[PDB]
Amino acid sequence: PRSLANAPIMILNGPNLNLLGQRQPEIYGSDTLADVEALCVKAAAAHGGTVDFRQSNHEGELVDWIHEARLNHCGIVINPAAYSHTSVAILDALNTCDGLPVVEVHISNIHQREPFRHHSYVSQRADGVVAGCGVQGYVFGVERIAALAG
Amino acid sequence: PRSLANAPIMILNGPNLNLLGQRQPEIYGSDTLADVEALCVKAAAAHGGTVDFRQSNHEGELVDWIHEARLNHCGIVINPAAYSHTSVAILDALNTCDGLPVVEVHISNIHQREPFRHHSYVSQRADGVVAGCGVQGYVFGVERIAALAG
Amino acid sequence: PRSLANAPIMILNGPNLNLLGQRQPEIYGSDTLADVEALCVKAAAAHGGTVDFRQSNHEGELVDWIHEARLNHCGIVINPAAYSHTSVAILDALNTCDGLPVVEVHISNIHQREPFRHHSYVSQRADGVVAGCGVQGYVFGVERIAALAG
Amino acid sequence: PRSLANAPIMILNGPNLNLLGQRQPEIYGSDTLADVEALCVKAAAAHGGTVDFRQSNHEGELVDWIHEARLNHCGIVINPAAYSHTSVAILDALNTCDGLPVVEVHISNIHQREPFRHHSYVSQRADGVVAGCGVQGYVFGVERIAALAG
Amino acid sequence: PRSLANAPIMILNGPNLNLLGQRQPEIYGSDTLADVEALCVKAAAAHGGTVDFRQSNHEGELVDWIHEARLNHCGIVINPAAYSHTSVAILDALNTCDGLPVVEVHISNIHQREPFRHHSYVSQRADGVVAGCGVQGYVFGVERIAALAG
Amino acid sequence: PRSLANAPIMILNGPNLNLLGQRQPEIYGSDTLADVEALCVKAAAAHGGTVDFRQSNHEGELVDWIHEARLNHCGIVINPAAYSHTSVAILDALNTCDGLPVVEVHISNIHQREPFRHHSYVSQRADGVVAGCGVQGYVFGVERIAALAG
Amino acid sequence: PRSLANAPIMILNGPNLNLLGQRQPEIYGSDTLADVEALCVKAAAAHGGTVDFRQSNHEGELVDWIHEARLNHCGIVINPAAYSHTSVAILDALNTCDGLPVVEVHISNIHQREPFRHHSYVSQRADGVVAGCGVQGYVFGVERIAALAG
Amino acid sequence: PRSLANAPIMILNGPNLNLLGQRQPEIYGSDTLADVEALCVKAAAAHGGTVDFRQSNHEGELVDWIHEARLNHCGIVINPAAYSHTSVAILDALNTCDGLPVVEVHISNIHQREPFRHHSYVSQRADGVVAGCGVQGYVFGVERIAALAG
Amino acid sequence: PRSLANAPIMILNGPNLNLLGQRQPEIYGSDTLADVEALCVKAAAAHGGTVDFRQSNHEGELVDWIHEARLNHCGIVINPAAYSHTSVAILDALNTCDGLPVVEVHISNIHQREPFRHHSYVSQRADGVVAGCGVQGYVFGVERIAALAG
Amino acid sequence: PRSLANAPIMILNGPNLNLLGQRQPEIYGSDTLADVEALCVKAAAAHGGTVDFRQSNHEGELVDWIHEARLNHCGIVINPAAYSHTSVAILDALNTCDGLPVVEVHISNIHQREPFRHHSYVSQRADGVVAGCGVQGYVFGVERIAALAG
Amino acid sequence: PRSLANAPIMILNGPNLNLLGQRQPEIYGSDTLADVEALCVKAAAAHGGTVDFRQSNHEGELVDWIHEARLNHCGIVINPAAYSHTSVAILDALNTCDGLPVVEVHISNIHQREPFRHHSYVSQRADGVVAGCGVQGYVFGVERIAALAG
Amino acid sequence: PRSLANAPIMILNGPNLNLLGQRQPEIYGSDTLADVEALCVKAAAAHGGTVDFRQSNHEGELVDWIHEARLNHCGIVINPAAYSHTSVAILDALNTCDGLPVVEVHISNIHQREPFRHHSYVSQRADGVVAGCGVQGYVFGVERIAALAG
Ligand SMILES: O=C(O)[C@]1(O)C=C(F)[C@@H](O)[C@H](O)C1
Ligand SMILES: O=C(O)[C@]1(O)C=C(F)[C@@H](O)[C@H](O)C1
Ligand SMILES: O=C(O)[C@]1(O)C=C(F)[C@@H](O)[C@H](O)C1
Ligand SMILES: O=C(O)[C@]1(O)C=C(F)[C@@H](O)[C@H](O)C1
Ligand SMILES: O=C(O)[C@]1(O)C=C(F)[C@@H](O)[C@H](O)C1
Ligand SMILES: O=C(O)[C@]1(O)C=C(F)[C@@H](O)[C@H](O)C1
Ligand SMILES: O=C(O)[C@]1(O)C=C(F)[C@@H](O)[C@H](O)C1
Ligand SMILES: O=C(O)[C@]1(O)C=C(F)[C@@H](O)[C@H](O)C1
Ligand SMILES: O=C(O)[C@]1(O)C=C(F)[C@@H](O)[C@H](O)C1
Ligand SMILES: O=C(O)[C@]1(O)C=C(F)[C@@H](O)[C@H](O)C1
Ligand SMILES: O=C(O)[C@]1(O)C=C(F)[C@@H](O)[C@H](O)C1
Ligand SMILES: O=C(O)[C@]1(O)C=C(F)[C@@H](O)[C@H](O)C1
């Protein structure tokens, strides 16, 4: 139990999000990942906190980073992307974050897409889930962490 | 296409929400519906808008109100509650609101509850879905409408 | 057992159909509910009968009206709309209309839409089911009632 | 926690039951709803209590009545009829009645009927469930509430 | 795009319909296939058209006839009978009739029979579907073609 | 067709019920099987009848006893316990008791437990089913038999 | 209702059976279709009857031959082969044979093979079904027809 | 590998068959179990063999008897009745009878009854399965064993 | 076991393919069946073989042709079209072609179309399956047969 | 809570295991049940305990023995065999053994066999489950009981 | 949109394919991955192109390579091996390769193997799918890319 | 085929197990991974062997390590953790270890947890599976490998 003041918010991004804003804009929009990071920096600063913003295409690396967050961060905002639908491993890693606030974010409204995107393993552990609010959902995520970590 | 300045945001609440803050606090919290309304009034005022906040236990009345919103409001934030899981009628009413922003909100994280709560008919039409962020999710809802209606 | 001459045909319309001809024309067409009523009045008059045309967004009100029909009308043409897919209540009300001819009508061809529209509880009781014949299906409905009530 | 002496037993009846004893007697029998009420009044009086017997075809009205029962009655005997199979809303309304005894009754043996009648949302919350004991089941219901409220 | 005046309506009947009116009258009635043809000839004549009425027990022959209709007829009224539930081939044949009006007709109400009759491949392509209106459904079918071909 | 006066009510209890009142009291209560027998003896005597109360852990023995009931008893109150969910054999045995009233009883509310307990083969044949009314359900069972055997 | 003496037993064989005894002997054996016919002729003669033995690879032709049997034969022994699992059309043709005895035969034990062979449409109408008794099952078939036609 | 001459055929009957010919004649007929035994004794004698005919309502006893047959009989004709649908234990016992001919018999045509009767564990092991040929199916059973044991 | 030199490659085409290149070009392309035949003739000639190219809309006729191939051809390239999804009969016919190479071809990528097109009975027997390579897939088919027959 | 020193370990074996080592060796091996007992006696003696080894083919008898264990033994190693997959009765008996260590053993690796063997009712209650370790699994079972009873 | 002349074809191989030709030859054959590369190099050279042939056991590394291909290669031939069945992440990476030809290849015929191998996430995006043509499938893959990239 | 004396036992641990003994002790216990390693070292030494103990959060790395085991180790004891439920890749890597003994271990009893943990891909290949025996299951594993490798 670190506060926004003692430790950053870890913002994790799963596979293919490195290409945000360069494909399927109608689905993901035209902002890049760097735009999202900046949005997150600003949203956190307004509460007196900071962020640690990461993206990986590797499941295992996401898991390693969650383990790091348990010791060094005050909450996790995660867009696990494709692994949302397939990774029991990320679910179990988050389950080890006892007491740590987790908010799941999806840019697109997964409930309107293919049936296999309707389910998310992460949602079983996440305190909150935001879907289809575009990149603004990331801000919502930071804000909810601020309120819970508070 | 009314703006936050020309027309209020309709905030609809479904069945049993009149008892918010008086039962199952661990699930729904201890804020009342009146507390929620005030949060929404405040969030909207910051963007220069107003709200029209209603609650009903009757599916058909929620439908009538959605029809009204099509003509007189700039967006809908809706917590359909139990009707989320059963009402094709509310989905079809929302489907007539062509171009109108709709955000679905749930206080609890439905994905951690009984399987029949996992599915929502509204999610197929909603631009955004926020679940398990407590009453704070209503604020996110207002905020997303402001940005969309903008 | 009233005849077309002793009692009107009750035409019941379920939710959202009050907006017929103002949205999703490619699906529902551009005729209004008033245009449909007129079609029904004409079709019935050719057989010497009349109609009692109603629309509601409330499941329970549709049930009440079915009860009324049992005593005072010669048959029912019903477009239960969304409730087609959810209402066991309307099915059971129609099951009390022993001997009364019922025809179910759907403007759109439900079998080509979302899977949850594929099933109708009313179809289990209805004598006939007409789908995807546009508003002309209402005429077919009145005609079948005329032949059965005859 | 009101006793049979401080408050009546609310007996709720759902849709189409107003026609009890006038159709499908082989299924529902030939007693009317008024006959049932009388049975209930008698059963309760033997234990020193009273009843408040209601029937509605409207889901939302049943919900309102359940809310009223939480504040003013000592238990609920409910035959939700068709809404047994479809209403998550009634379930959640009953879930707010913390500590209040609920007994679910069905005149017919739903397990021998159509598959969609096999499931009941209410059963998940009801303390007891009686099916296929005819209208005598209502008496069993009053009796169990007397023993639990005791 | 032929009109009712330039080309007949093809009426296709699938397997076992050659025995119409000689078995299971309670299901299919006591009119024969020849009686149906006469009804269709009359309904079409009222609009200034003609019909080409055929029956076969062979899937492939139905398919051949559908091919013929694309070049020579103004619409198809089809009762595919058993092949309704099993023939992807007839579906695909109809899918080649781009722009040609197709109405699917069932004498019995399939939705009240065995579960395997509840689904029809043809319903995915057909403009309209009529079920359980007895042989009168064929007249409806001719009438809808007349209005679409018009 | 023996009456309560010519023949006893057979009360059958399935496996593990010999341990009633010694484990999982919160589920099954703290009354023992002997306590239940006494309740039954009393309920029956009030109507002028007697009971033959048995318990077995063997499926085939329960079947044997059902066959004996066909010839010598006036009705059966059965709590098949675990065999409720697995024994087609008991169902068929009961299906041979033509005209004999059968009431199924469960102490716990099976609908609230593991999904495999949600279904009962016996319910298909039983006239009435009582669940979740504790050992009082046995009295309800005796009483219904009295009214039916009457 | 023709007797074994007035009319032959029609023995129908579905697709690929023309190759019996030339492939997959371990499954279908090494007797040919001609061997089977001879077994059938002998089995029927012992009861004073005759057979009309046919094979086709065409569904519709099997349907035409069933129609013929209704007028001219005393019963049907049918091995529909692959069509067993797919042909609603053969089912409906047999359903028109009111009062005619039908026995379904399979050489192999279909219940031990692929799951799609586990189901047969014909079994819903057939009076008797024999599977896995090799070609001897045809004799069983003839015999049962003799006994029923008797 | 005993022959019909060295060892009897064991004919096993499952639960409730002791009441054959005294209930549901339309389903099971009016012959008794003794009548069936006599049929079997006769069929077997014609091939020079004998039978050992048993009935039990206990699964475990059927199992024990199957073990005995492995050492002392030349084949098994079995009608497992309700245990057909539930007993993996009988299947596994039959799976220990390496090389021994087993024929499964059902008097009724299970494929026309309740869905839970459609499946039989025994069918996976049985060489042949005869269903719906009435008690005559037992004779077919004896006859197949004679040909296989030969 | 005939070689490309002793016997032709049979190329079979199922229903509706006679219309290739005249409808749904975006799905099937604009080449005609005659174009495909020419591609096949060329591909085979390069390896020293010939082809026998056929199309039918009749399931049973495809079956007959497969039988012929077993005796007279060196392999089969087959596009069963709609029958891919429904014909157990074609599968079983192919199963009699022991040792004969079979390659299944689909012009469109069935895995991207309607769910009922995702499954093919032929795929269980075919040595190779080619889907969504347009008409070029037929050449891949000829080439694989050449390499296997070699 | 008896210790290995105060009470034996009950080793229960379900149906058909009396034939261990005489059939399907590749599956169950060639050791007999007597060989397993000796392995269990030895494993237990090393910890200072004893065993009470039993086998039955009767579900109810297994249940009775479980009841006996609750009072007189220190843990249960059970191989329910076929009943693993069907017996809710054995599960509930084990559920009465509050605090008593249970280990489930399977000789074969059920997860590689037929789908119906994949599931076990006992596994829900068992502390530990061992599958596919041959007879050695029984030793692992004794060992775990020793460590838990310790 | 690079041509075969401007950019190589990327050939990706998923997990365990580094062991090709050293295990399960009957399934995968005896050619090695180096043998496959050589076939690919030759097939491409005939069209004037080159290949970039890679193998990895890491999902994320496949994803990275697909990203690279979007910028630097003219098409992708991919055998995702096990990830075919589990990786939404590879699917989404391919989905970013707008306009890039993709062909999926499987050496074995997956439709004849375990059910979990029947489905592939890649098949939803791949232009073409080749299965069960052995390593020759890779050649087909290069050839199709050549024709599409052309 | 290396013996315990020629080569170590590879013990593989999947994701999140690095945190063993620091979270969810009631599920996984309070021993650490280092404690487990020491148990394994000891169990193996008693049979004259050694162990090579590894843990990774990366699927691909586990696969690489399995490849290494094929050439250098005498067996594999694996706890794939979350990848148990999702990784077809690990299954296939194990499938390449022809003849190598594999034991699957799970500390918790997965059959009592969430439904998605009930299935394991590794169980299809593993010689033995041990679940819910705590960290003692690793010792069982080493022992079974010793006996098989022997
Ligand atoms: O941000 C999203 O909308 C998502 O998490 C991202 C992806 F890339 C997809 O794999 C998910 O389905 C949705
Ligand atoms: O806000 C919620 O958590 C919810 O919408 C409200 C209800 F009342 C429930 O019926 C929903 O399942 C959740
Ligand atoms: O007429 C119709 O097409 C329909 O009944 C009307 C509605 F509004 C929908 O809810 C139904 O799905 C279809
Ligand atoms: O009392 C009953 O049997 C029931 O609750 C009443 C109805 F009206 C039906 O809708 C229910 O399925 C059963
Ligand atoms: O006209 C009909 O009702 C039907 O199309 C005809 C048949 F012959 C049956 O096969 C169909 O299921 C219904
Ligand atoms: O009385 C009961 O609640 C029950 O019939 C008894 C048992 F023992 C369980 O096996 C049933 O599931 C419920
Ligand atoms: O006779 C048989 O065993 C069968 O009817 C014949 C065939 F050819 C198969 O298609 C059936 O599945 C079984
Ligand atoms: O012979 C029979 O039809 C049967 O095997 C006998 C019984 F008693 C039933 O339980 C089986 O379903 C059918
Ligand atoms: O070539 C094809 O894509 C196909 O086999 C042909 C048809 F006509 C369709 O029926 C198949 O589903 C696909
Ligand atoms: O020990 C076994 O492998 C088993 O428990 C024994 C039997 F006999 C089978 O019924 C089980 O499926 C497996
Ligand atoms: O080439 C194949 O057949 C496959 O892609 C390769 C593997 F390694 C398997 O995992 C796939 O299921 C099939
Ligand atoms: O050791 C176990 O119990 C487990 O394999 C370990 C994990 F980490 C989970 O992911 C598995 O479901 C269980």
Rounded CA gap, I33 and L149, in Å?
A: 61
Give the atom of ligand 6 at the shortest distance from the alpha carbon of J92.
Answer: 10
Question: Is residue G100 a contact partner of residue G128, using CB atoms and an 8 Å limit?
Answer: no
- Kindly calculate the radius of gyration of chain C based on its CA atoms and give it in whole angstroms: 14
CA J113 / ligand 7 centre spacing (Å) = 26
* Mutation probe of ligand 2 site: the residue of B22, B103, B107 with most atoms within 8 A of C-beta: B107
**Residue recorded with tokens 């045809």:** G138
Joined tokens for residue C6: 């002793």
Task: Give exposure, G87-124, as e/b (b: 16+ Cβ within 10 Å).
Answer: bbbbbbbbbbbeebbbbbbbbbbbbbeeeebeebbbbb
Give the residues across from G128 on adjacent strands.
G103
Question: Is residue L86 a contact partner of residue A86, using CB atoms and an 8 Å limit?
Answer: yes
Rounded CA gap, G8 and G76, in Å?
A: 9
Joined tokens for residue I57: 């809309």
Q: Which of these, H146, H12, H147, H124, lies nearest to H68 by C-alpha position?
A: H12
Q: Which of these, F116, F40, F44, F32, lies nearest to F82 by C-alpha position?
A: F116
Backbone angles phi, psi at L119, to 5 degrees: -105, 140
Q: What single DSSP character describes residue A65? A: H
Tell me the shortest Cα–Cα distance from A28 to chain K, in angstroms.
12
Catalytic one among E73, E83, E106, E138?
A: E106
Rounded CA gap, A133 and B123, in Å?
A: 12
- K16 Ramachandran zone, left/alpha/beta (phi>0; psi -120 to 50): left
Taking the alpha carbons of K27, K29, K30, K31 in that order, is the dihedral positive or negative? negative
Class of residue G41 by CB neighbours under 10 A (exposed 0-12, middle 13-18, buried 19+) = middle
Q: Which of these, D111, D130, D125, D119, lies nearest to D82 by C-alpha position?
A: D119
- Give catalytic status of residue L138 as yes or no: no
Our answer on whether the CB atom of C13 is closer than 6 Å to any ligand 3 atom is no
Classify I71 as helix, strand or coil: helix
Experimental method, per PDB record: X-ray
Sheet containing strand J51-55, edge to edge, reads J51-55, J9-13, J75-79, J102-106, J128-131, L128-131, L102-106, L75-79, L9-13, L51-55
Our answer on whether the CB atom of E56 is closer than 6 Å to any ligand 5 atom is no
Measured between CA atoms, the residue of chain E closest to residue C131 is: E129
Class of residue L1 by CB neighbours under 10 A (exposed 0-12, middle 13-18, buried 19+) = exposed
- Chain centre distance of CA D53: 9
Rounded CA gap, B130 and B122, in Å?
A: 12
Helix or strand run (H / E) with residue E150: none
CB-CB neighbors (< 8 A) of C61 in chain D: 58
Helix or strand run (H / E) with residue K63: helix K59-72
Class of residue J81 by CB neighbours under 10 A (exposed 0-12, middle 13-18, buried 19+) = buried
Rounded CA gap, H65 and H77, in Å?
A: 12
Helix or strand run (H / E) with residue L105: strand L102-106
Give the residues across from L54 on adjacent strands.
L12
DSSP string, F2-13: --TTTSPEEEEE
Joined tokens for residue C135: 């508003």
Rounded CA gap, K92 and K122, in Å?
A: 9
Cβ neighbours of residue I45 closer than 8 Å, sequence gap 6 or more:
none
Our answer on whether the CB atom of E144 is closer than 6 Å to any ligand 5 atom is no
Classify I97 as helix, strand or coil: coil
Give the residues across from I89 on adjacent strands.
none
Give the atom of ligand 4 at the shortest distance from the alpha carbon of C88.
Answer: 10
Cβ neighbours of residue A123 closer than 8 Å, sequence gap 6 or more:
A104, A129, B109, B111, B112
Give the residues across from L9 on adjacent strands.
L51, L75
CA angle D92, D95, D98 (to 5 degrees): 155
- Chain centre distance of CA G103: 6
Instruction: List the single best residue of H123, H124, H125, H145 to mutate versus G (max G Cβ within 10 A).
Output: H123
Backbone angles phi, psi at C88, to 5 degrees: -70, -25
- Chain centre distance of CA J148: 15
Cβ neighbours of residue J95 closer than 8 Å, sequence gap 6 or more:
F24, J125
The Cβ of residue E54 has, within 10 Å, a number of other Cβ atoms equal to 15
The Cβ of residue C46 has, within 10 Å, a number of other Cβ atoms equal to 11
- Kindly calculate the radius of gyration of chain L based on its CA atoms and give it in whole angstroms: 14
Rounded CA gap, C31 and J80, in Å?
A: 68
Give the residues across from C76 on adjacent strands.
C10, C102
Question: Is residue E93 a contact partner of residue E119, using CB atoms and an 8 Å limit?
Answer: no
Joined tokens for residue B20: 């918010």
Helix axes E59-72, I59-72, angle to 10 degrees: 120
Identify the nearest ligand to the CA of I29 by its number. 9
Question: Is residue H13 a contact partner of residue H55, using CB atoms and an 8 Å limit?
Answer: yes
Identify the nearest ligand to the CA of E80 by its number. 5
Distance set, CA F21 to CA D149, F12, F27, F41, F105 (Å): 22, 17, 10, 19, 17
Reduce the secondary structure of G24-71 to three states and give it as a string. CHHHHCCCCHHHHHHHHHHHHHCCCCCEEEEECCCHHHHHHHHHHHHH
Classify K51 as helix, strand or coil: strand
Backbone angles phi, psi at F120, to 5 degrees: -135, 125
CA K92 / ligand 12 centre spacing (Å) = 28
Rounded CA gap, B82 and D92, in Å?
A: 7
Joined tokens for residue G47: 């009861």
Question: Is residue H99 a contact partner of residue H1, using CB atoms and an 8 Å limit?
Answer: yes
Question: Is residue H110 a contact partner of residue H120, using CB atoms and an 8 Å limit?
Answer: yes
Catalogue all structural domains in chain H, each as residue range(s) with its CATH number: 1-150 (3.40.50.9100)
Classify A12 as helix, strand or coil: strand
Measured between CA atoms, the residue of chain I closest to residue E89 is: I82
Joined tokens for residue B29: 């919290």
Q: Which of these, I42, I40, I20, lies nearest to I31 by C-alpha position?
A: I20
* Chains F and D touch, using 3 or more CB pairs below 8 Å: yes
CA F116 / ligand 1 centre spacing (Å) = 36
The Cβ of residue D138 has, within 10 Å, a number of other Cβ atoms equal to 25
Joined tokens for residue K44: 């491409």
The Cβ of residue L114 has, within 10 Å, a number of other Cβ atoms equal to 12
Rounded CA gap, G83 and G94, in Å?
A: 13
Give the residues across from F104 on adjacent strands.
F78, F129
Give the residues across from F9 on adjacent strands.
F51, F75
Rounded CA gap, J143 and L139, in Å?
A: 11
**Residue recorded with tokens 């009634």:** D90
Q: In this complex, which of H58, H63, H121 lies closest to J15 when CB atoms are compared? A: H63
Rounded CA gap, L125 and L14, in Å?
A: 17
**Amino acid at the residue E54:** R
